[PDB]
């Protein structure tokens, strides 16, 4: 199963930085040494087994993207699953960006009429904090006026905080099929194991595939998933400095207990128990019961 994802945007908007940080295990300080992307850099990402993401890291320069809409129009915009257009919020040519975004939208509608548009308004860390909301809603009122042709969500991203993983989790959540089945599986696992919060990650990129939070969840932060993803990616890089693979995490807090163990061959599961009376050794094989069940299910199938 191949999904074709377009990564378009203006010159210097930061598309290769997002591709390197999310998929190629870069950090934010290492993207300053990234060179210019000449034409299109095709990337194949093995994400959740049989599903393969075709990432088309297109060049953002003007002579490249005049060539994209004229000669390579049939090669690029045909069979497009997700179109990602990246907007630099510190760009002084936003009216020049809107016309090019309209041209890319017109080519995408004329070639692949069943596609989803994501407008990532990048470089939000260069905007001061109290102005970081009403500026973004200023652009979000424009692009949603522009993008009435297809389904479009606009997200404010930056590589120096947790919003990048939220945006890329929202991007790859639509590409994963049968997500109500995984949501029902996580709901039944949290009901069976008496867990407050069950979050399923990916093994390599650590993007949040699915999550389920019960009413007994002690966490009140709405941006906790991408924060935990950043935590486990930083610790995976710390383990990879020692040439070792992180396998299991166990915690016993004052009122909680968090367990990060591998679930499938391509996932990690975070299980949080809100009851301190439940020991670690009960939950650490309560997860293994479901792991043995899905191994027995996937052995026959």
């Amino acid at each position: 199963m191949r999904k074709k994802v377009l990564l378009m945007g203006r010159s210097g908007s930061g598309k290769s930085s997002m591709r390197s940080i999310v998929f190629s295990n870069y950090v934010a300080k290492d993207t300053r040494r990234l060179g210019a992307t000449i034409d299109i850099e095709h990337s194949h990402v093995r994400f959740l087994g049989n599903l393969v993401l075709n990432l088309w890291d297109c060049g953002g320069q003007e002579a490249f993207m005049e060539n994209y809409l004229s000669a390579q129009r049939d090669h690029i915009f045909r069979n497009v699953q997700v179109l990602i257009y990246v907007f630099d919020v510190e760009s002084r040519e936003f009216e020049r960006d809107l016309v090019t975004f309209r041209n890319c939208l017109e080519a995408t509608v004329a070639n692949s009429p069943q596609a989803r548009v994501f407008c990532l308004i990048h470089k939000m860390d260069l905007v001061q904090e109290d102005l970081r909301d009403l500026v973004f809603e200023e652009r979000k009122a424009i692009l949603l006026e522009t993008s009435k042709d297809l389904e479009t969500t606009c997200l404010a991203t930056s590589i120096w905080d947790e919003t990048l993983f939220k945006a890329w989790s929202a991007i790859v959540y639509t590409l994963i099929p049968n997500t109500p089945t995984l949501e029902s599986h996580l709901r039944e696992f949290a009901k069976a194991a008496e867990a407050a919060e069950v979050i399923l990650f990916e093994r390599t990129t650590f993007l949040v595939i699915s999550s389920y939070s019960s009413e007994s969840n002690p966490a009140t932060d709405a941006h906790r998933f991408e924060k935990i993803s950043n935590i486990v990616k930083q610790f995976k890089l710390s383990c990879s400095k020692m040439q070792a693979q992180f396998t299991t995490f166990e915690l016993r807090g004052g009122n909680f207990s968090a367990f990060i163990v591998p679930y499938t061959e391509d996932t990690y599961i975070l299980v949080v128990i809100a009851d301190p009376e439940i020991e670690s050794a009960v939950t650490l094989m309560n997860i293994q019961s479901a792991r043995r069940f899905i191994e027995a299910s996937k052995s026959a199938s």
Binding site: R2, K4, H42, N54, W56, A71, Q72, D74, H75, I76, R78, N79
Partner: protein, 400 residues
Amino acid sequence: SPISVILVSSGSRGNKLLFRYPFFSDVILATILATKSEMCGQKFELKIDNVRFVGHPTLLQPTMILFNVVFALRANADPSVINCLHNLSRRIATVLQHEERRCQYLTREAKLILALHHILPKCKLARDLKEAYDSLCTSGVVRLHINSWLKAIRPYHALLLLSDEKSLLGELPIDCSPALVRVIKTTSAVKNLQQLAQDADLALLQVFQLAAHLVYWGKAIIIYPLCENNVYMLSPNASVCLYSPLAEQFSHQFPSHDLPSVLAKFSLPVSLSEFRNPLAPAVQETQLIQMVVWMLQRRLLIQLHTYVCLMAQRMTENLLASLSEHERAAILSVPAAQNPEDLRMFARLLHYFRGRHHLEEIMYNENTRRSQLLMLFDKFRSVLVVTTHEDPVIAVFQAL
């Protein structure tokens, strides 16, 4: 001799490399060799450091838009190698485009490639590209099992098949033309192309075009027909080694004789009539005829033709005065021009007496006997110069 055969596709799924027979990476070569739709139908010549990529991109008319058959060359080669490799690439690309139009062959084989030593029996396209590479890398007879799918040829030449006729009818498809199967089923080593045209009820230009198509793909050759007056000669490119594979094939097909002995019988210029001894039976003679046909298929023999060069009523005088007066006075100094018929016989063949047309062409085009032409050479022995050498026309017809 090219380095490699590269098949590069392009479309909405990205630039992909489908095949590369001698096992730059595949992703880098797929990025390099992929062209756009504006570059289709023209010659693609690209040289990176020392390798030269010659190909012909063709629009596929599925996610694929473009495909290209690319031959990699060492860039010290002649431009004739580049021209014939571009011709081979555009012919293979036209064949694959017609296969895509017919039965969706290229898209199905590309899906079989993308689903995946072991690739060669599983893929027919890998087999015919390997056959094209093996036909390019060797000067011998290599069978091109790709597809049939549709200049200086003379009417006195003969079309000789390089393989069995039954195998050629087996390889031809259901939708083949009636003219091609009539040409293959009708022709013979002795029967020339004019009798091939008037016996298979086809026009001569269509027979010439089918013969050119047959000798391009390595299924036939253009030779002079077999006759007892044909003086043969050992070719300089022949191999008389006992460890040669052609000697092994001659021992496998003819176990009664050995190849260096029979090639040593053709050391001196002798005809087929000089082989025929009263002690030798006719079965030995027919076996020798089959062996001559076999090593003419391997280009181990050359035919020596007699070439004549020129030195020092009203239409006869006009043709005699068409040339210079010094050679006219040299002709008048010969007393054998006092005959009335000899002047007309000399003046009728003045365009043929330049050393470019041999005696067989003169006796076929004018429908004259060899004895009359030898008598004409005896009358003008002090003017004409008579030499014997091989025909350079025969070396042009080869599998490119």
